[PDB]
């Protein structure tokens, strides 16, 4: 009966200090998404809790931060996948930077003397404008479509120097009023609705 | 029969515009976290995935894009509540970036003119220094453990101008070895394989 | 225990002779919808197996059949609604009826003289042209999609005077990549895959 | 992990096109059963959703539109398979065509006017006893049963030449008072209530 | 402790019901068939602990069937009684002329035979007697299970030894629909012809 | 799918028929056993519904209509094994013949001219003496226990020259105080409350 | 969210802790019984798995160590009641203490030097005689069955200073061959297979 | 089917009598645990009830019943594994000695003369702090937690002549906060939140 208990304690350990050990997550994968409440991203890429390191931030785009934690998952805990699934109805298609800006300036916010990263205070900006640009939304960045981010993004991490490229990049639209993900770019709601000739079945 | 087909059309109507009707996620909640593949969130808050805007990064740790993020959810998203949730066997308490920027160095990265933010182009440091700074593991912030750095992100977001003063924010550690949270520095472990003086049962 | 056994059987007898004693289906409903195999109805609609009286055809389009199975139901077995289900990737809406006629053709029919209800001789046409229209493709009949169908069939039932004033109809597109209902020209999925002023939550 | 989720989704743009695609249902079945509501279909032929397309009218009851809807499901979306399911205590066997005929007329019907295929004018009957036809109820028709109107049906589409002679086409009747398919003129009922000659068992 | 107690007097008196003088849970006494077929608690909706089932070759009464509903009536405090008969009967498929002849022609005396070893006072003494003691549905003029669960009934309601009080129903299990019926009310074949329906109004 | 459906239909019919068609119960087996109401005579036998014929009279005793049924089952239903199951607390076990017999005469019942069976009247007793014999309780059969009333049905049913010589006969005593057979005359719970020399595990 | 989380570590806080905080089991409840595999107390009891504490020994008899575990429940841990569980085929009731005393002193065991409590010297015996009884079989001690021996238990523990006067004291013996409780020296099974006179139901 | 009863009967008579026929336990395993209402050890350990001896009481501490009951269990009952398991939060813990004898001797108990064994005379003390050791409190015996006490009784059960020496013995600790059993001084818990040099996963 003792050797039972040793195993599932020895298992146990492995599963709680699997970082110091040098164990990776179960499907080698990290995925960058959004923070939306609707994209419940584990289903919709068929894995289960163990499998990815999952990032999550406002609009699923690559920020300095997505991409210091894509460098160590790859590089130091054994990730070899990347996906990035944007989604839609992104809050981040729904306002603008100058929008935003302005709503902060008319409370008493200064964008030249508001310190963005306390932890790291090396990072300043000096402008109104770069300020605007910080906060990603589509329209500042010149995406129309997330389906468009998507690709950017997974353009962005596979040009990135701290990435290693052994590593497989891709890049899916989550559909929030279908709880589905599509290709970029690959719409079939508009052509089934249509008339399109049809094969006789062979 | 109709009727009732009517208004769940307009339910999954309002589920997939949300972002655009102003509606909120159901707990109006935000929770900041790690990307790790074994802190199973929504498990242990007891939410659901549409009850909450879930942040995740490597360490669960305020970066700009934490604060980026949380400064939208609160003021445009309609959130009011925070929780920070740091681990145990944190990636960021394994190694220290003086380590992490030797091995890019060795791979031939220049840390003075790597893209962090390549589309946030005023991102810049100028220092080896500021990017052994920019990983922001534990060590190198001067933390010791999850349950400080749980109560140190809620302190900043706490005093952050971008984030409203009424939000409630909370901290905990979600311990990987019981997939439990806790707060931080109220450990049960250690205080229940000791001698401590009991009371007589009344 | 044989009062009970009694009630029971009671119960049995009025559900294999609603027919005969008079009882209509339990919520007075008949739907007109396709007979495709990837339609799945009741659960669309949001009913149980005995709530309906369920009409398939090839389309889900106002036939002879579909009115003669309407009137029936709506004046001798109780039917007070009606609802009307077209769906997304309809046969009907992928050749014309020229392509079959001419196909048929082909094969030995005989548009004048083929027997298009062997019950009901009465029923002929005399023409190729007649042959092409009762195969009732929506290119034939001029409508351009499910939407569409959908609001027609509606109407020649709502104007019909086999089936009484006092039924209440309304039609719906059954989406087959999503399972689920819509209302016609109803469509969402192009307003949030891009840029639209959205609302600051209250 | 991208390489399933490809997989899924070409999977997925199969289902939704399968008319433009040439793709048939999974059983290549297609079915003329009844509206009524009792008639629990696909449980009791142990189908699963996509297996069959399903034909459903009054009475089960070969007609224009399922002749229409067969030709069409044969010959274009490749069915193999032919299963005529009519039911007990039908609605068609407890009224005639002459009581149903009086109603209509004592309410300011005209048969000779009524519009019976308002997308098809061709179809026009010129008499009363054409009207008190056209409604196929199983007694103007000359059938005393659902076993005889089963096979009736199963005998008219076997001998129609829009219905390729290579389908196989069979006959039952489901009974509402047990929710299950006998085969024509084989009821168990009857024999087993009765004296029988019996076997010794060995 | 308290509630143990309470739960071992529960087993005693479920041990000793027929020393104490509790009667089952429902006072109901049923005379069925042996058929395996007939699942008869199913069809009557019943626990284990419900009823006393008497249980013999076609659900027919016998001197054993009078003799065991007597003592649960009388003694065991049963009110109700259920008779079930049911379809595809071995009663109703053979004669005891065919399964006498049988008997015959293996040896078997039927005077000598000794039918209840137990009671040597039942005696027949007459090779009719034997064929008419099988009970048959044909040797006795029953056409049908509905028939014989409604003369099952008529003859427990007229004996002496069951009381008045009792109430004394008929039902037929039907083996392929393992579901029970009224005799003589047969949905199955009222479903299947012409019947002048009414309208909904 | 017809195939199926037919195939099932057929195993309906047989099930349906078993006793015109000569089909015997699954088991082959015959069971003797007591109407009351604890003994659950099945799942104490280990087996399932269409396993056995259960015959079941007052007290698990042979009678004639015991040796009726159980000659019908052997000789022309196939039956080759019968298991007699007396209980304990039983009722017969409880009363004697002369005081129901005088409980039946206070009611005015003429011992003498009462029918013991009304459908064989060529059954008759002619004595008060008889009709205390016929009602069969232990004390008046001069049975002690329910073990030994087991085995003296077993005794019966083997030398019955109605019942076949090559059927298996065994017989069991039901224990209703916890549910469970018992082999005739095997009382272990006297046994395991006292002293017994027990060995040592080798 | 924050509010069930605090709630549920206070709840963990006090289980985690019940003896440090003088909390007691859930019932107030103490049992001695048998350190036996076939004896499942806890659903004999019908406890749950938090309502007792379960003292356990070789035959469920009052040791010294009993008393001390007993004394401490009641005085210190809240314990008002107490349940003493002996059990059928007790392996204290199938050997004597002479021949166990022989045993070990044929592997060269010496009794008066052997220390039966290492943790507690002061326990010593200096005598063969002594080391039988220390072993208290049954036949040492001068009982005959399981239900003297619960019933011995429970003087023992009623009329000890240690143990409280107010404490409620109760004893059972556990059937191992029924897997259920019974009131000392009440045995059912005897009068079950034996004529008893009944009564008729009222 | 008489084949599965008496297979049956022969299972259960061997499963009452075990003691006397020489039948050990399921896995031949004892187990020395504490009687802590907290502590499932069956659970923890992966068994059910029959497959171990399991002896309980205050602290899981090997006393002369420990000791008693192993010898028997070993040399008796086939056992060939001990199985060692202390707790958390464990009573003999949280109180000292001296606090419960001058409990005790204030409400008039005089230590040098109450019966600690009344059932063997033979058991003595004769001194004060004799009765203060005899309660066995962790304190009292030097001993700092559960995992000190776990290895000091496989320590002293492994050293006992009357334990075999082929015997295997292994301790462990039931931690009480997590339902969970841990290896004695291999605590995860306080390495999970304090630096440790990771190693890069290959
Ligand atoms: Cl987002
Ligand atoms: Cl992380
Ligand atoms: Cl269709
Ligand atoms: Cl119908
Ligand atoms: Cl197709
Ligand atoms: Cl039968
Ligand atoms: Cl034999
Ligand atoms: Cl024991
Ligand atoms: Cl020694
Ligand atoms: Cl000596
Ligand atoms: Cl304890």
């Not at 939306?36 to 690559?62: F, K, M």
């Not at 929008?99 to 508001?114: C, L």
């Not at 605007?132 to 596979?158: C, H, N, Q, T």
Request: proline share 4%.
């Amino acid at each position: 009966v003792s050797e039972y208990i040793d195993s599932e304690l020895k298992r146990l350990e492995d599963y709680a200090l699997r970082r110091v050990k040098g164990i990776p997550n179960n499907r080698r994968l990290w995925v960058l998404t959004c923070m939306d409440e609707r994209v419940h991203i584990e289903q919709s890429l068929g894995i289960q809790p163990d499998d990815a390191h999952i990032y999550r931030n406002a609009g699923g785009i690559v920020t300095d931060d997505a991409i210091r934690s894509a460098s160590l998952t790859t590089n130091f805990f054994g990730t070899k996948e990347i996906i990035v699934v944007t989604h839609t109805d992104c809050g981040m298609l729904r306002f603008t930077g100058e929008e935003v800006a302005k709503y902060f300036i008319s409370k008493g916010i200064k964008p030249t003397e508001v310190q963005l990263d306390p932890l790291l205070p090396a990072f300043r900006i000096s402008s109104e404008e770069d300020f605007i640009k910080w906060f990603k939304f589509y329209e500042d960045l010149g995406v129309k479509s997330p389906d468009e981010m998507a690709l950017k993004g997974v353009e962005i991490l596979r040009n990135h120097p701290l990435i290693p490229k052994d590593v497989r990049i891709t890049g899916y639209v989550y559909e929030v009023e279908t709880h589905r993900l599509r290709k970029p770019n690959q719409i079939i709601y508009n052509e089934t609705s249509k008339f399109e000739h049809g094969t006789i079945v062979k």
